[model samples]
Target: ATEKYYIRDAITKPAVHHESYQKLWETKWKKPCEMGVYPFMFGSIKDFEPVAQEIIKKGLKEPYDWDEYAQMYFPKAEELAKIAEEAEAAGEKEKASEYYLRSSAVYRISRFPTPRSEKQKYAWRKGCEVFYKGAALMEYPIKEVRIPHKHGIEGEGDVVPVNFLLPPNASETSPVPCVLIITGLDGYRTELAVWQQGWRSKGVATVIAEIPGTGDSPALRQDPTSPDRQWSSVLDWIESQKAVDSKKIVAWGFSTGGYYALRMAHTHKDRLLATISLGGGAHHMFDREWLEHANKLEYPFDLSNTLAYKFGYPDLESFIEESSKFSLLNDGTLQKPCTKVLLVNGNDDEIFPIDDMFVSLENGQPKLARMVKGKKHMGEPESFSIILEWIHKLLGLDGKIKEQLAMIPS
Candidate 1:
């Protein structure tokens, strides 16, 4: 956790006392800071004077408490960001695209906290707008539509907006096999929408929506029963659409969204042919142990802090009480056993530990699991292929599912 250690020349030389951290970081912190970053050590961005200077000479690596920052952690992201920038400037668009995507993945680990206030949110949205509305439009057009939550979360808001992407072949038949996507806390519907567009090319439809309190989805107005009930309400709409092959519906979720996907399947098993969660979160995604240790560096507030409001409680104790009602481990009211679930999780997942995600599925009716090696919270490219294969197999895609899936009881 060498996230942001404080450094000091405690033996203060009154005559040359440094100013605030922003100032000290500029000069005294620069050198060591540059050295602290991996390969970037030699040619890092250390131009800021005082702060950067002090960091180099007398700073304490906050949580890491390490003598050298660069030695403490990998600098894969910084180096990749630099590479992407260089490639883009050199007009090697293809190479630049690959490098930027690589950088974005790594950058995700450390950049979640910089956007703390409303002001930050505006800048962040603006950044996304430029990328999606500008550069991304050149290679892939961006067309978005809003679908009012025909039935909003029980008393939460009027809209449960969904975004759709048309198929690559407009002439293709309607009621395509559709993919419904939900993202984690650090992600947005827009980011998720980009992935949805890919499915459209294969004549598969995609519907993207935000969980309550996220995206353009309505805010939770303290509907006391189930905080996540909106999922079922939204599904009510998805289940009725003619453009969706109700029988071949694939529900996909990533991270926290993974939990949503799983829960939905557990409750609405008969309606879906297959459910998949990549780098999936389970009932225990928000457990006490997970909240305390995972992603502490990148999140501004404590896990308890976030949970408090999510549960409509002012204190952690009260929040915990409320959360227990929805724990995946609780078998209070889940009646239908799900069809087939294809779970993809990293063995060493950083956010919601793999052990929790894996064990939570012990009761999944008909299920298959794949544990990726050495991967963090994000799954790799092969994840999609595996998930698609699972869906096809479940829907009798190749007439081989009954044998394979029958091996386990649903």
Candidate 2:
């Protein structure tokens, strides 16, 4: 049987209840697209208008032809990338970089929730190329880092893919505190690297990591201990660098990556000064009852479906059958002494239980928590400030969050 406490919480509908892609785009995605946020990072209305018009003209409905849907964004994305190349040829550095990122953002959304199909896979590859090109051109860039994964599992590769944004002046005598930011299931290193520029502006170094099973991570997703080794290898590498202050290292995970953050904070407490798991889960989230309905909830696509694939499962059925094995609670990860950690999320998150947030406070080393009354996953906007201030204090900095946030594209 499953845990009863969280099951008692009222379940809610998906964030956007729509019958078609057009409707879904109009309602749930339109605003984020306009503002150029997650799933739409670096997007502009000009970029998406044509796609929207095509979908409307086609009257595309749910259970869409994903390849066809992916095709809609290709022309525009390539066009933008070409423009970026043209700008580069003309020595318009800023325009070239901005356009490349824009192209990658379009490809980013096209392949979201995983690149399961051919077109989606192309989008993923192309997206990554342009994203790196764009970042490489930035004044303060998040560069691709390949670290030796000495602890890698058999099927995994020898090097872990990471992105590090070390401040130009960070050196032996002026070492800066670093935040190891872990990307979520859907958010990859490219977009989360958005945090790097901001943190660099505040004189902090940030290393962007992909949790096991997401992005280009080489960890075996099914192995619960994979993240422990992954972070250890990263920590090992950071220890070798004189510009990075290993003593002040903080781990910050977003969404599913938050789960990994919680696990790493406990498994590698010696290396991390603190940990923040925003919209993360520990247990009960793997419960059949919650997962049975999660596929239809807040996340735009088949959440459980993609999750199953991400975790190396052949299908959702098998994942649901074996998923409990990966829980931090089931593995006794939460029972151990942990470094300072924070659990934060919306009280009403259907993606994962709010109870998972508070459960940590009752266990080893009481964790700081914030349940944004009615906000959704990650408790955005408000939660951002809470985390920035907390990190500021931990790093012994007095910079304003607004100063860092300004680094994001307006």
Candidate 3:
């Protein structure tokens, strides 16, 4: 048997969740479900009552069968979709919109962590279809966009898909600040789109793109330079949009996307006014030891396997060995000039260490860092205000936070 060497010599271990599905729902997921965040974006607790009961009956745990676990949520997802359609046909636009978003949330959770299975991919497709139906009914609809992946190579596609939300007042004569949000491994443009409305309400445009490998990114996953090219193409498109103020461009990278965001801060320094890495890692995160112990940490499923697949490695061992090549420290990415940068994360994050933030600050020009005392990955509920305040000053926004939060669908 191939030994799982990464976990064999760990000096520290996190308090991992070893509970049943029902226990997890009652403890960990329920609060977030009610709050309409992560795994439950645009979702509610009522939606999961019966499904959670059935999942508890099945009694599954970690190292799950991807397809089997994914299909578990399909019946409820389809039902919600039908309900949405029925409401649309009955001319109840608001109800149709709410139901569509709810249906997509079910599919979103169905493909949670990754969309590697057949049914999971189906869920991704349906999730997109349904989510857009809901978005179209918003005061401002989300526009599906495609820009040429000009830096792409032989193995990749030529187009990168994006979800763009432009302010109604934006135009060539009145260009607005734009935020380019690059999503992480498990969270795609679908979930990241949640931030658009808030930004749009604050008189900013939002452009949501996926990092290479995850979602519909056209960059080759194995190539470290893929993100560089991927973001360059995104900035090029941003520059082309006359309604977007090219001089005020900002990039916000979430979770795993934070790593890519950090790199872009240095690589495309001249093109952006600022960049934020919300719980991103740079050097130590790629260590073989970290990869092995990662799955047993804050992440719910097989973290190492998903990361290996994201980076285009066929196996965990190879990924661990080769990951250093992608490091900002080894490649000297941080030594170069960077835009006004903000490193934001929770100190107790089990996914990426706070040490990476220090690594970022020590190199190049001075930057900003914010660490929530005992928060988890991305620093959760507290870091939101810190991020918004930083970006608020940079983008020259003029709206109140209360009004911005109101734009979110209740």
Candidate 4:
């Protein structure tokens, strides 16, 4: 029997539960388009509507075939890249940037779940490079940074790629409070670029980085405490930034990224002013039974196998055995009092159990949590707005201004 998950039923346009393909299109692909990540300002519905239709026609089921998925969008991505180059040659910087961003977005979805093959890896790297080019032409400055990966498996000195952006008029002499941003399993640094300008306008600088097993983060996967964890490297780079207020550094994580943020709040407590975990999990998320059933619901694709690959496991069974060791509850991490941490999630999160936050509160020093009623994963439209205000307050910034969220109800 399929285990029941906590996804909610709503009067929303795209019902939370529907045909699997439609659910993914509405939430992951189309929702992001609404959020300006792949704004319609650049292209009409025609750009993605056909792609969605084709996937539905293909009758894609759980554990979607990666190559099949990539092929569906590859032609469109290539065409967009061609258009971008033509615009660049014509001295149309804005148009070129828009097309390049669109192309990057297309390539991003082509490798959605994870890069499991050389073709997908190429697409992922191409997407990153393309996005960087587009971002460079934007009104704001987006700088690429490199942080040494402390825990390379073969003792090789690897580095983590980071996207660093500064607020208007920020400089060494005029440092700004900075937020270290971490993205989850599917949503990556490129997609989170939409938040940079909002943070910048609020007199805050932004550091966008990915957690291990996601994006370009090079942190070791098997042992959570590999001496050279991803966040440690991120913190080290933040400390060296002259345009960042070292004392006011805070971390905000999304989805699986939230799990890492929670871990950082305890593991690297002294390095941050405060930490925010949006729809994160810890102990229970790794339970064997949960893993077995989670694959069918939490994500649009294969969650169990994908998670196994993410955690550096050769197979699902091995990943399950290793999961218990990484739990904060069993390891006595959450039991001890820790730093300022805010936990936010929908009461009915389908990805990671919302109750995990409640479990965290039981053993830790008093922590603040906001459970959005009737909401789903990451608490959506409500979560970001609430989180921004709270983070601003925590940073002692003036005026409780909330950033507009382009979230679609699911």
The prediction achieving the highest TM-score against the true structure is 2
Question: Tens digits of per-residue lDDT for model 2 on 1-410?
Answer: 23354534345444453467776788788888888777776778889888888878998775767798788889999999999999989999899899999999889888877877899888988998998888888877668889999888789879888888898899989999999999987888887877887888777888888888777888897887888888888999988888999998999999998998898888999999999999898887787777787777777777888888888898989999999998777888888999999888887777788878866665677788877987867888788888898899889886598777656653
> What are the lDDT scores of the predictions, listed in order?
0.51, 0.83, 0.83, 0.74
**Residue-pair clashes, model 3:** 0
Candidate 3 per-residue C-alpha lDDT over 1-410 given as tens digits, one digit per residue, 9 for 90 to 100:
01322223332554345455665677677778887878677787778767877888999766567788888888988898899999989998888888888888988888878887898989999999999898887678887898898878889888999999998989999999998998988888878888898898788999999988788899988888889888888899999999999999889999998998899999899999999999999987887867777766677666778888888888899899899998899899988988888899987676877778887887888988888877778887778778887888777676365566645534
The sequence of per-residue lDDT tens digits that candidate 4 reaches over residues 85-185 is 89989998888888887888778877777777667788888888878887887777577787776545663238888788877777789889998888877
Q: What TM-score quantifies how close candidate 3 is to the native fold?
A: 0.94
- In candidate 4, stretches whose alpha carbon ends up further than 4 angstroms from where it belongs are 1-44, 150-157, 398-410
lDDT-best of 1 and 4? 4
Local distance difference test, candidate 4: 0.74
Runs of candidate 1 with Cα error greater than 4 angstroms are 1-116, 124-142, 153-155, 170-174, 219-229, 236-241, 295-318, 331-335, 379-385, 392-410
| TM-score, cand. 4 | 0.88
Alpha-carbon deviation at 177 in model 2, angstroms? 0.6
TM-scores for all candidates: the values are 0.61, 0.96, 0.94, 0.88
- The C-alpha local distance difference test score for the whole of candidate 1 amounts to 0.51
Per residue, candidate 1 scores C-alpha lDDT tens digits across 1-410 of 11211111211212111233333344433443445321111122422232234445655333322223222112554455577678778887766654544443333322232333443344344334333332343254444444454445455566665656545543325566777787655555544644654465456677776554444556462442342456566667666666677777788887666766777777667877766777765555555544445424222224344445444567656665556555666643233477567788766555555655555556545467887776555455455556766666554445343343322110
Q: Cα lDDT for residue 216, model 4?
A: 76
